[PDB]
């Protein structure tokens, strides 16, 4: 009869065919914007773990401190005194709490110190004859007493004298010394002559290769932590065999020593993400991401072993044939 499951005794039917699924997934091709296959895999990473994992690279939480403030030695950043990192994290809630300053080419110094990956500092016996040392301010309280940046030495008149300061300090080491120094811009002529005797200061930090000369700039600025004066930070890099020399007849904010510069693979990143015990070879401001996929849509800013940032949030790679379902109606 018609439900006979066999063939007609002298023949047989053999059919060749392929599998299919009830729920395919759409992928893009050269000819088709959307064409359905049996399945696919996502090539774009668009989800973050939500936090910065810290077991892979050494991540250092700056907390209330920028990398520059930690370097200069802002009292409340004294816990970052001799530290190092693969990645330094700067928070949006960070703040400065010492004497108000500006750094010409702030971004470059930040980069230089960040790539080096270390704040290891070494003091040096700079002989400052004829001047008062360790100047302090109420805008920079270490404890309840007036103080200053810990890596800087605010020099002022000793009695009736502020001589032409003439100091050397050679680099007999096998690495580049980074020296941080500055100049004080006072608020008024009366204050300039009071602190430095001379009417118009000067600062000349130099080596055999390079030199920088800076002149103070009298005039009141906005009040910041009770102070109308300002300080400008500059840097000088001294190579092995070379020799630092500092000359000044006024307004010098001198260095106490050098920072050790390394050729490094370290960096700095701005993020408010929690840092936690987990493992991930790629960090973004949003948090860590896995790096199984070749691309990512989380953030163009990344550190580590990361997928490449693209605009697309999804790209599907077919891992199966065209899906041609059995039932037209389900």
């Amino acid at each position: 009869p018609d439900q006979n499951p066999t063939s007609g005794n002298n023949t047989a039917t053999l059919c060749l065919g392929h599998h299919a699924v009830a729920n395919g997934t759409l992928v893009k091709t050269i000819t088709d914007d959307q064409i359905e296959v049996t399945n696919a895999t996502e090539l774009v990473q668009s989800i973050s773990i939500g936090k910065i994992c810290n077991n892979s690279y050494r991540v250092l939480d700056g907390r209330n401190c920028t990398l520059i403030d930690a370097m200069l030695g802002d009292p409340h950043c004294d816990d970052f005194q001799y530290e190092n990192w693969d990645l330094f994290i700067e928070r949006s809630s960070a703040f400065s709490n010492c004497y108000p300053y500006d750094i010409p080419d702030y971004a470059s110094l930040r980069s230089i110190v960040a790539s080096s990956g270390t704040l290891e500092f070494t003091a040096e016996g700079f002989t400052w004859t004829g001047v008062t040392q360790n100047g302090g301010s109420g805008a920079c309280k270490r404890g309840s007493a007036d103080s200053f940046f810990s890596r800087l030495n605010w020099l002022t008149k000793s009695g009736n004298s502020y001589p032409i300061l003439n100091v050397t300090m050679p680099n007999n080491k096998n690495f580049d010394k980074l020296y941080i120094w500055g100049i004080h811009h006072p608020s008024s002529n009366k204050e300039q002559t009071k602190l430095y005797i001379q009417e118009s200061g000067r600062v000349t930090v130099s080596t055999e290769r390079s030199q920088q000369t800076v002149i103070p700039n009298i005039g009141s600025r906005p009040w910041v932590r009770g102070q109308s004066g300002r300080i400008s930070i500059y840097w000088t890099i001294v190579k092995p065999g070379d020799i630092l020399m500092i000359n000044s007849n006024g307004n010098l904010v001198a260095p106490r020593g050098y920072f050790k510069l390394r050729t490094g693979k370290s960096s700095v990143m701005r993020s408010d993400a929690l840092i936690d015990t987990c493992v991930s070879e790629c960090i973004t401001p949003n948090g860590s991401i896995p790096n199984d996929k070749p691309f990512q849509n989380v953030n163009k800013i990344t550190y580590g072993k990361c997928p490449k940032y693209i605009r697309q949030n999804t790209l599907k790679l077919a891992t199966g044939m065209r899906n041609v379902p059995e039932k037209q109606i389900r």
Binding site: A12, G17, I301, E326
Partner: protein, 172 residues
């Protein structure tokens, strides 16, 4: 599909086939049955795994780079930093979009190809003992129980055994 087998001369796929990607469905003197072909299935999966190996878990290490977000307005040099990053992102976005387009077109084509290869392989085994009905189906012109179908699936089917019987049913 470029060989016109999948979504072509084969009307549609089989949802009941969970043991393979390609295979056979037959009717004979014992009943109707289904069986996967592991060799064609494996060929397709291996080529697709090759693509995955080329693309999955392949990432460079980068460390300090440039800034890409800015608090203040600066002008010339910030323009350049932004243009550089914006140029790089556009080129990588293009690479990914094209990588996926080509690979998917190829994937569809090579699975269609393995379906066509399987038919052509089977056709060669049956020689003068069967005819193409269409729809990827062969009518075999001799009695072929489950052992006989299995010998075709194993590639041990000797067409000479049934040739005379078959020819006589094909033409008479």
């Amino acid at each position: 599909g470029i060989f016109g087998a999948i979504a072509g001369f084969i009307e549609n796929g089989w949802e009941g086939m969970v043991d393979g990607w390609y295979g056979f469905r037959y009717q004979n003197s014992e009943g109707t049955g289904q069986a996967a072909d592991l060799k064609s299935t494996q060929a397709a999966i291996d080529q697709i795994n090759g693509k995955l190996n080329r693309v999955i878990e392949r990432t460079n290490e980068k460390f300090h780079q440039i800034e890409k977000e800015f608090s203040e307005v600066e002008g010339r040099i910030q323009d350049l930093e932004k243009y550089v990053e914006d140029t790089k992102i556009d080129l990588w976005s293009y690479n990914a979009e094209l990588l996926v387009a080509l690979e998917n077109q190829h994937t569809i084509d090579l699975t269609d190809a393995e379906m066509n290869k399987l038919f052509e392989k089977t056709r060669r085994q049956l020689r003068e003992n069967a005819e193409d009905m269409g729809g990827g189906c062969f009518k075999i012109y001799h009695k072929c129980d489950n052992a006989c179908i299995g010998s075709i699936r194993n590639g041990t089917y000797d067409h000479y055994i049934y040739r005379d019987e078959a020819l006589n049913n094909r033409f008479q």
